[model samples]
Target chain A: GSHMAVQIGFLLFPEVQQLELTGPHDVLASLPDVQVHLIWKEPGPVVASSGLVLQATTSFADCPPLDVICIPGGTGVGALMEDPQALAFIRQQAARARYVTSVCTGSLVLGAAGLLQGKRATTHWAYHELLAPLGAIPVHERVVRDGNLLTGGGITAGIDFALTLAAELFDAATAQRVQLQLEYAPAPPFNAGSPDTAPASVVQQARQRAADSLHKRREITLRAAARLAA
Target chain B: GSHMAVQIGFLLFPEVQQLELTGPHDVLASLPDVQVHLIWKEPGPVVASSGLVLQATTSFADCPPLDVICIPGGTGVGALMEDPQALAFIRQQAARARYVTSVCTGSLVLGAAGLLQGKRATTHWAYHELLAPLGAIPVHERVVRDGNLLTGGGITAGIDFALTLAAELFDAATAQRVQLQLEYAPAPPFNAGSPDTAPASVVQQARQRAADSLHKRREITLRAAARLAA
Candidate 1:
């Protein structure tokens, strides 16, 4: 029997940060009796911001009702925020999904789709402040949960986010088993993952490198926020 | 300028654990002036063990001398061990590469390629004992380093492996900045990532679930070991 009890779909778009999507994917797909789908407007190759290419398995029009709907963030999210077809697909999915989630800047897309109003959410630390413009009560944390809406910080947080979701969907024991299977114990070489722990010089360089993209993201986010308000 | 100063290539094969590849790719690609390539027998879509599909950007024949060569592990590795073409590519690249590395069960592939002979290495916990047959002095750790050879434990260890490599290639500051950009702070919901950390029942369930794959892997490794001995 090819029947899967749970349907999980991730929104795949061009220029996405692949880790945000793949991390959660690697974790959630480990669950029993679950089917995973990468959904886009069309089924084809989706190039990530880092130049990695991932395949979209299902077209938005053909996607089934998902138990969990996730949107992962990247520079591509600027374009996704304005993509009506993608936004409409997310809106439709959120209406029926048991959980609607985002990783990093993906929360902006959820906000653009009007799903985050009055919700306490989180995103990439650099963009944490931007959530306020989108009608979300911004919280600073690695993973934030508000009712059935789950959001994770930045790229790597998706792993934690998915594991937490796994526990919520199944049992803690089940989630722990999957965690053991993936060997999710993390040991970073440095304590520089966040702005607080990073050396000031390192933080400066990161902010400088991302200056152009951050500026662009801010502009796009404000416009999306305005649209949501209107 | 189309020229990148550093060339890092990862072996992409069917049934690979995608996270082992992408986790490292995401980190290493963040380094300045580095080009990351997904190399395969041919350039096309290669499906991972979890049904996720990734594209191979460079064919083995077209690959240039790489500064770093990495092989990530999965069920597909059993076939890779017997493929002369892939093993030959790895050997040829390893001869000139500054760093030779593997993540998860990828060390098994390296062993099959004859790169781990008498070298300290590690792999997925379940298959850690199998390394001895292939001439590797197995080490039990999340990440292991022996001269220019680096290996990481299981799937999620790839992130640490790559960041460690990044620090080796560049400086710690550069790697830290990249880590900050990705927000690599990890927090798993459960402390069940390893055999020792997980509950006994969870570990038993995991072993049972992986029983079939483990059996096949054992048979393949023994044969590969015999070939190496011969």
Candidate 2:
């Protein structure tokens, strides 16, 4: 029965951003009667971008039907843009999941799966423009919801997104209770959490550092877009 | 050299709080040339309280000297509070680490290791009283620093703690750059992130739910404190 457990799944793969997966994972898993699964193409360990590794207990083919299926972003996502198996997995899950969602560059993977066609979504600020080529309208908000498709911006936005999703799935009070348990109060020491607030030099330096990776990602995205058109 | 690379280690154990580890891992790993390691008594996967499993890359015996050593807390920390081997490992590393830190109830483990003696520290709000027997001056701040012992509040406070430490270890501008990359500007969906803001009923429910675990933890802590004195 649906009352037994609220099944939620997170897509796990190599080079994933650990925060993107764990942020939402922590919040969503805290909900009472919720069963969370980390699913990948194969079972075993997936090393994240930061050298942290998470184990996938369920393989894509073996994963149960999930009410909510989420993809978390990292450099590994670029390779998934044209991955037939991963895209097919998302497409199948999106067809039945009550909510299809992603965090950071994960929206790009959803787009590659053709789930974002003609839908308004969002992603990491740096790659917001890339959403357009995949037939999605990219919004700048921290969390964007166009119908049942929800997307969160960047890595840390996963926390905010999870709380919002929790309220929608359960109740606001339940979500608040989880928030309290986590002591979600935050006090960042600096004001440079967004491009708009960051110094010009800081933004430039970040762009320079990401130039090569972004270029490769753009190339893969372009190829995936072509496949979608075909 | 510290200038060459900032070596940071996150202790991984069964039932650890994934968010507690990942929040800081995400931030600290973003630092230029920083090396982050997930270490445990043995290699393989360790499951968190939420059922998310993280892989430990190095055994405690094989861990390299680290510039920063951090511990994250969850249900498993109760067992570690009285574990002699884990405590000894922490003591050896703390002797050489530039900063010894932790998040959430992780302070309790540090205390068990006799590292928090006569030090001002903080922990999960619900367990602040438990710190008294361990010889720590409990404070109600989001982040507390007494010399090289930097402690963070509850789970979500890890991000703030890591950013603060980053600023102190590197510079404000460098921390700012990392913050922007994470989009760490938080907008909590509710005001129930702390006991002061959460409704009285919510706090009561939380205390009730945690009653059993807290009892077990208290017993272990008393024994550990006794061991420390001996």
Candidate 3:
């Protein structure tokens, strides 16, 4: 029954980065013969930061073994840090997963859950400072596969990350086939991937993101980083 | 009945690019007031070339009027030319819809249905040449706005297109807000956009993709284009 359907786990939370989670999640939903689900802190409807209430297919406390566990990052990471149930669930399941993955600020959430204490990972280019404190040396790649922990850069990176994941199991031809199917051909029609490519005004504003939390995420990360040794 | 819950009529067929339709369709699904559906020619489930099977929310005669009608393109456009039902649905909707849109080669389908014979539009870079036969003056853009028909470039363009569509109806701020939620911010891991941006060797390789069609798509597109005057 387990192998009959690839049970991929999607851990959702209120304020979760909707696309980071949904982008790849849609890919899974589109996949054939796989039973992927959204596992949340609660079993009811999960309200995203965007004000859309998505259905929760599973609760972390009672989820099955996952071939892949996707933890998407967003403002919800703040709440995930304090949710004892969420952190414990991630820790237990991630330890047994065939693959563990994170996107955007989700890498930070993975670190917060003690998944990346010594792992080199990447996250949303904005809240990257939180990486060091979590004992996870954040890399800059859009999709970084550090052995078992697969991490991706910010939002749109999840799609690439999913493609990379597809490339891992599926052959290059199969993956590229998927690529062309998604019409993976990308034309940004804009020149902005980070502060470097962003306009002066956009850069200035982007750099200041969640700045007020600089101190708070730092202190929390440091204290949590120390606990990883145990 | 159609207005009770938001109904989205998503078109899918063989080679139908998934992301172009899925990206924006997901945005509509994110709207709590709507229900997003996948409608195909004749189907139990239609698998995307990307290796995912999207459940057919409905069939031709069963589909309800979607506030949004999404069309995605792929290498399969040649086959769509013969799909009378698919074309008829597009024709019926374009005449009566609040909004009608397509991404990538989907515009060719709309054009085949006589929807975009004279409408301004856009499509994926690799296949824009085919659009001409469909009576569309394809604009090489990520987002094309022609009154009610919105066209987007390539695959990833769906993100910006969906965000823009969100803004158009919900208000710019709402769209911008959804942008932040989708974390619609994109950072491509690679710089390759069109064949032009790639190195001469890469461009040569990409253009070879045209060989995959073996002139079949060309014939379909030409016939579809011929029907435009009717």
Candidate 4:
């Protein structure tokens, strides 16, 4: 076994999208000479938005310096949008990490941390516009790369993000090897993965279902932006 | 909120592939009027093959009759191949399940339970041939559907399998709705997700890397097949 050359951490918390974290963890951990950690403010069992629970292996105080720090998103991200502790930790990590990344609404947390100021990033489609208030240029790509920062689109984009990150860390060949092992050739049963392509009714239904959470998120984002300004 | 109409359960175990379970869990749990459970022999935490831990919410004895039963495979599945309790539980659930499904080497487990006899199935490519000794006809497709038996090709196929399963449980429209919500439009970042598409050297490397595990799996599979015959 080769010694791990890079250390990767995924922030775990209540209501975090398990797929957002697990999807990337799967790809990144598959890389040669890489160590992945599930880090949180406290180490314990954290339930995801979907009701699945995942164990957090390390806490903020005990976590090693990571080469890459990724934050995944969910409805839980609403509370973190203005959380000082969460923001501070992300800010501290982003200051020195080789790559600071996010998946879905996780970019909102990054924006809250003030790390996205003037940086190009992306997030879950519904929440993409909120990035602008936090001083970020929101790109609508599945995976967006800007300098040392990377952000992926909604939940499933974590796979694409990590695979892209894998290539950056090693080479395209290494990432391709991991992709083959995972057999990631996707054939989605539908083409309605984006608002642009989804049937109007389906998009309306999704927006309606998310309306409450989105409303709360906007308020949180506004408050967090104020903190950043201060 | 409306009552759940469908209850789906995925077998949870130590060393199970995180993505194999999560990829589908993410998709299936997104459907409205659906309940999904991470079930194990007992309720508690089980670490995945990737070192990520997931909590099991229900015990085998306490778990309710499920409409769908899925098993996702990893190197750890090697142990369950012959475990009487696990095999019996799977057989019991599969007997009445609307769909009996597996992703990756999970098909091997279904085979061990004698569920795949004369049925068309699929598994991780390297273990594809292993299905024959279990009296099953192996297919190389990403997702194979035979009657109510559904098997996905490999780890990431869970997403495709669950989406496909969703359509069956409801309709194409419902599945498409969930797909759009998940932003299931995948951007793989590479064309190396399949042996047919990957470089020859990469395929050789994957096989070489899995040689030890495959060798061990073959022994376990053979022993288990013989046990089933007895």
Candidate 5:
């Protein structure tokens, strides 16, 4: 096994869901000789939609070539889709990166960046259908891998996505070791994680709660899609 | 249900595990009318053991009274166990908080605060036995609730711990809705999340890797325990 450090960069932006970034980060950072980078337009505190604040370690202008580039999704993704500078950065990094990946609605950002055209991808369950407008064939799976573009389903799916990436980057044994250390065996208190399993009322409540954000996201997604087509 | 805002404070110290704090914060912050606060001795950027950096939103002296006080564990927990000021802050918060909680080795910090005396608790598997010296009856469960003191086992268990807490704070329906939003149904790629499920080789590797940190943690725990006894 090579001891050379592998650089993994996560795009951190305002209102990006912290769990999506932190889960995969905790998994990948556990790999030996791996450096995880929290990236944004500038190096400073970026608040997630949930109000958790994280510090960006590197700015897009100064980021080095990465082995892996991951984008975590959240309400802020709407604005990210319209930011040409961020999209250009993703394009430049994806051009040379070993893997282009996203978690939850982050796949929408990749699609807007012109990386997900015709690619099989996945995102947060609520926004799964939105991937179609971004030119992605949305797959209903926790993690989807097509060529070198890997996408995880929802916020928590980033953990599985990262572990899968670990196996590809290193080996199955190394990934298993990381899982063991994290005690990744999950015991969810309820079986309501997916729309299929959750009661209809619970699912309705979730969607209703995010109705305004969802409406805005759909409009923004359509605009990005049109721009992509243009 | 009253729409009163609920304040939940998470202790953010240098070298605390990012996932342990972020996971639960993500879940709890999703609750209706809930505010999550990242707290430290002083307000600034606090780096996690894995090098992830988070911004503290509140200082210990400035923090408002919290409905829930949570501690997340990592390599930095050893120092936290020895910090008199931090311990005092926890003791004070736990006194008025409706529920006192911890994730992973954060339980060690609680035990050090003298809050876990004769209380049942759990922590990261590798450090489970160390809880005994701190006057906690160690339980081998993902989430243990002895009265209002809830402790989660290992790093990832924070997700389950938070969901369980959500059900307690609100209702099963509310927690189920939160689970659906996060897509909390987990599917680990490998069955190595616990020593009981992991291959002996992988377990041994994890232990060997954490040996130094574990040794130091044991010493610090004993010192804290002696102080409690005195």
Candidate 6:
């Protein structure tokens, strides 16, 4: 209750990885006393990158003054690159927020908005290359924090980023309190979470298969060229 | 690419924990080649215990066969316990689900549906006394699997249940693969997860502070008794 209300905004786009948004959403909302708003472009139900649709509590137009605006990654962002409405919204919000953070492919859209210029950011390992075309210097850290700009790696990094933000912006106690509230002690029944940890063959196979989704996204994202044109 | 689609059927009802549903909702959807559905008593957009709302992709009328069906816990079960309509819906789907699981207070609802009658299950640590009434044999494990029935402790345990299901029903390779996909390596800045890891007073204090929310829910949920009256 002692902390000032930091209007935290998470953008919900179609085909976005849900954890990239909710993992952090749950963690940050755990703060003992804070105001959090789950925001979507137009509100109502938004489908995740995996076909699961979620109903957000608020919309961008009705969103509070954001102290930190978070855009998490998803498989659908490449397609969003061509979404003029999404692009315009991202551009407008990124320009005004106190801290603009991107998780996974969300930074790419931030890049599409032309906000990543000269900023060192990070994103999911699979889509880092696309960052360059958006005028962003992509780093490979799990959690990258530079000034009021923060970006994290992959889908799950949002939880870590939220913790980092809590500790840095608030206090360790607040972050720790939120962590405990979430019972953040994770015990995954299996091991492979990244290419570095999986078997060489599995990694190779995944890369080969991952190609198509990425390929489709990249090709489709070009449709957003009209925004760049504008 | 080698992985086939994993369909996760998440049962939802009014008043269930938002985190219980959202945690797994975000986690399962994080994996590639997976489809997650939010199914409710009747479908449409369902509101959660904590006031968050999510859209149901399917109703009992149109749901497909599932590899995994997860039931999330919340105080909402009080209504479901009494509502023959909701119980009938859960009973029908769970009868066919390959993996039937529950989290937090979800165990009680599942037990009421006759799924946990003879199973080793777990729910919110705070709800220990409520289990016998539901006909479930309570186990202290955060994640417990008994045949096709799997259940977990509280909110954070959904991550573990999902991985365990993947490991058992799928393969270690698939489990590990999805584990990595979730970036399941968690770093909670605070150690407030459970009694074993959390400080003694923290758990006690949480119980004390939670009284307000719990008490309010009691007044409302007890009304579910009417549904069972017939």
Candidate 1 Cα errors over 4 Å, as ranges: A1-4, B1-4
Give candidate 2's error at residue A85 in angstroms.
Answer: 1.2
Segments of candidate 3 deviating more than 4 angstroms: A1-100, A105-113, A120-150, A161-230, B1-7, B41-44, B228-230
TM-score for each predicted model, relative to the true structure: 0.97, 0.96, 0.67, 0.97, 0.96, 0.82
- Model 4 Cα lDDT, one tens digit per residue, B110-200: 9999899999999998788799988889899999999999999877788887888888888887887888777777888789989999999
State the lDDT at B57 in candidate 4.
92
Poorly placed runs, candidate 2 (over 4 Å): B1-3
For candidate 1, the TM-score is 0.97
B102-185, model 6: which lDDT tens digit per residue?
887777677666666667887766666556545568787878888888888757678777766666656666666666554555
Candidate with more favorable, higher DockQ: 2 or 6: 2
- Per-residue CA lDDT of model 6 for A12-34, tens digit only, reads 87777877787777677766466
Please tell me which model should have the higher TM-score, number 3 or number 5.
Answer: 5
Candidate 4 ranges beyond 4 A from true positions: A1-4, B1-4
Q: Tell me the tens digit of each residue's lDDT in model 1 across B78-147.
A: 8998888998999999998999999889999999989999999999988888899889998989889999
lDDT scores of the candidates, listed in order:
0.90, 0.87, 0.68, 0.87, 0.89, 0.70
Each prediction's DockQ against the real complex:
0.83, 0.74, 0.18, 0.77, 0.76, 0.39
Error of 6 at A182 (Å): 3.6
I-RMSD for candidate 6 = 2.6
Of the true interface contacts, each candidate retains a share of: 0.84, 0.75, 0.20, 0.76, 0.79, 0.48
Q: Which regions in candidate 5 have their CA more than 4 angstroms from the true location?
A: none
The TM-score between candidate 3 and the true structure equals 0.67
Off by over 4 Å in 6: A1-4, A30-35, A56-62, A82-85, A132-137, A167-171, A215-230, B1-7, B26-36, B61-67, B132-135, B180-184, B212-230
Error at A36, model 1, angstroms = 0.9
Q: What is residue A222's positional error in candidate 6, in angstroms?
A: 9.8
lDDT of 4: 0.87
Candidate that beats the other on DockQ, 1 or 4, i.e. the better one: 1
